[PDB]
Each structure stands twice: as C-alpha cells, then as structure tokens.
C-alpha cells in the first residue's frame, strides 16, 4: 500500500485496476487540523489571566 | 528539382527509468477570515416611576 508506506529504498509499484477513482484531501493537511483547533494561538482573557 | 528533403518523427521515450516527472501535484489550503461587527442598537425609553 503506497499510502501506508514511505521511503521504501527499493521502491514499490501498485497497478491501478479501477474505473472510478475519488480523492478526498480534506483531512490530509496537518495545518487544517491545527486551524480547526485554533486559527490563532489561544490566549486567556486578561481579566482571567491575572 | 523535386525531392523529399526532411522529416519529423512522433517518437517518444519509454519513461521506464522515470527520467521525466511531468506535472507535479501538491496539496494546498487557503484561509478566509470573517469577523462579525456590532451595529447600533434601538432603544425604547420609559419612565422609571
């Protein structure tokens, strides 16, 4: 499985035996997960941080 | 003076040594920011009595 592996020294090959292929990339980026957590670093309100 | 002088071929390499990459794909994301403003209120005055 090319998706699961990486840095394979001898390489690998898979044959695409398929007709209709879909690619959902909404969850691929790590930055998207970071933004969903907090678009900007979280800051406690000054009234509470004191 | 009539002769064939030249030709061109539709020859291509077999990219089995993966010399050529072709086009590249990379995953990207853009961010848009929409802050919500306040607007002026409407007031109903009444006496305190």
Q: What Å resolution does this PDB entry report?
A: 3.5
Name the one residue in this structure whose structure tokens are 């390489």.
Answer: A11
Of B30, B32, B29, B25, which is closest to residue A29 (Cα–Cα)?
B29
| B chain contacts of residue A25, beta-carbon cutoff 8 Å | 27
Residue B15: phi and psi, rounded to 5, are -80, 50
Task: Report d(CA B28, CA A29) in Å as an integer.
Answer: 8
Residue A34: phi and psi, rounded to 5, are -65, -40
CB pairs under 8 A between A and B: 9
Report the SS3 class of residue B37: coil
CA-based nearest distance A10→chain B, Å: 14
Report the SS3 class of residue B38: coil
End-to-end CA distance of chain A: 53
Q: Given an 8 Å threshold on Cβ–Cβ distance, is B31 in contact with A39?
A: yes
Task: Report d(CA A27, CA A36) in Å as an integer.
Answer: 11
Deposited experimental method: cryo-EM
Neighbours of A32 (CB within 10 A): 15
Number of helices (H), then strands (E), belonging to chain A: the values are 2, 0
Token couple for B4: 């064939």
Task: Report d(CA A6, CA A43) in Å as an integer.
Answer: 38
């Amino acid at each position: 499985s090319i998706e699961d592996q990486g840095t394979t020294i001898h390489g690998d090959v898979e044959l695409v035996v398929e007709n209709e292929t879909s690619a959902d990339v909404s969850s691929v980026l790590a930055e998207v997960d970071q933004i969903e957590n907090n678009p900007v670093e979280e800051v406690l309100d000054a009234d509470d941080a004191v | 003076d009539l002769a064939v002088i030249g030709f061109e071929l539709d020859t291509r390499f077999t990219n089995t040594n993966r010399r050529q990459r072709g086009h590249l794909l990379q995953t990207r994301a853009l961010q848009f920011r929409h802050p919500i403003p306040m607007h002026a209120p409407v007031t109903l005055p009444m006496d305190t009595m």
